[PDB]
Write a protein that binds this ligand. Sequence first.
Ligand code: GDP
Ligand code: NA
Ligand code: NA
Length: 423
Amino acid sequence: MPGREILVLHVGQGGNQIGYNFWKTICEEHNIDIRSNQRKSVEEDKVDYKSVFLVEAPDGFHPRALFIDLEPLAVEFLVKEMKLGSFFSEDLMVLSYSGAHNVWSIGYQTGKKLIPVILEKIRDTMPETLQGFLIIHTLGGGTGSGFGSLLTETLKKEFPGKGVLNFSVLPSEVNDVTLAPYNTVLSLNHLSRFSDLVVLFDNTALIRIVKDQLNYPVIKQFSDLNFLIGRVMASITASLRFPGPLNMDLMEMAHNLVALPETKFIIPSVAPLTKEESEMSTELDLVERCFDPTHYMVNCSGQGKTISSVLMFRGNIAIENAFSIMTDIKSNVAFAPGVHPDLGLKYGICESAPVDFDKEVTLLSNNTIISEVFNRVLERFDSLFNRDWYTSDYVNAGTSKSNLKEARDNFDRIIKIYKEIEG
Ligand SMILES: Nc1nc2c(ncn2[C@@H]2O[C@H](COP(=O)(O)OP(=O)(O)O)[C@@H](O)[C@H]2O)c(=O)[nH]1
Ligand code: NA
Ligand code: NA
């Protein structure tokens, strides 16, 4: 049946590398090997709706996605190493050759030449019942930040009735790109006007989670980092792909989170993170872990104040526990002073657990602690802007020094709005 379709757009090196973990997770959950595009079997094929992310074809299943970048090596070396040629096909690749050089303005301007080709690929493979788009990118670089902001502005303008949701990767506590404060403020300022929901991550928290919650002995490639982002994307969309007592789509979750038009910046968290922990935990254990800063995928100093949260229960869930613990959540977890004791929670329940897991809870939190995370970016921004450092290559690419003051002021307004609701 038509409807519920979603198109994903991967921009830059990070956005495409995260894309491998996401599509590997989607295929595994739908009993599909990503190598031959086939069903693994008919006996293990479950009552589901593969059409959310997958496109059915005679040879097999393909992703409803676009793999976009301003240089060809990050995507190609990914497909060669992981052997994704049959799935990450050439017809889904929008590549160019010049690169963005970690400059948001260059990625924005250069990406404008690929917009006509991107639209035509969308205008063909898109069902008119498509419910929205997901844009996967990093904010500290150039292509994911600049071109990604461009695809956010474009799609929201091109398809006003559809949801445009961003999954954005913040720089680590110490940025591994010196230009990141410029690229992050420009991206966040752009997404605040054209995006419906911005789900944020950073590598410091992702690394902390992998080392402390999964106990990996080493992290050698980003695949041992990006699987957390793919787990969030797959689990928050699980009710759209499998049976459940309580389903929810993209804009349903967005409408429950965005209290004020500017409060669209979300912090995700998942618990548990190993198989053996899903079998001995309770719904109260997982929810408490999700609301604990040790499980936030954004590096935060504390629990903060929750404005509004979306909770997805997957798998072997006791419904009576999920509802009875709501008073414990409202009493133990700090919420914004304006949140009524009976509000701030949006529930989703899916009978399909993540692969090999007994159960799992995914949290999407609209937290005032975003003001603290954003104030760090602004402080890094001002340290460079007040000294006129690295501004020439942004001015030479269309972004005036006045424009950098425009995006920064509007970015500071977002901080103060989150500050004011906090009390
Ligand atoms: N989590 C994650 N972060 C990444 C990945 N690749 C790059 N980054 C981060 O993104 C920033 C660099 O942006 P990048 O995507 O490499 O440049 P771009 O191709 O111009 O978008 C740095 O802060 C990196 O730490 C990835 O695969 N996973
Ligand atoms: Na790059
Ligand atoms: Na790069």
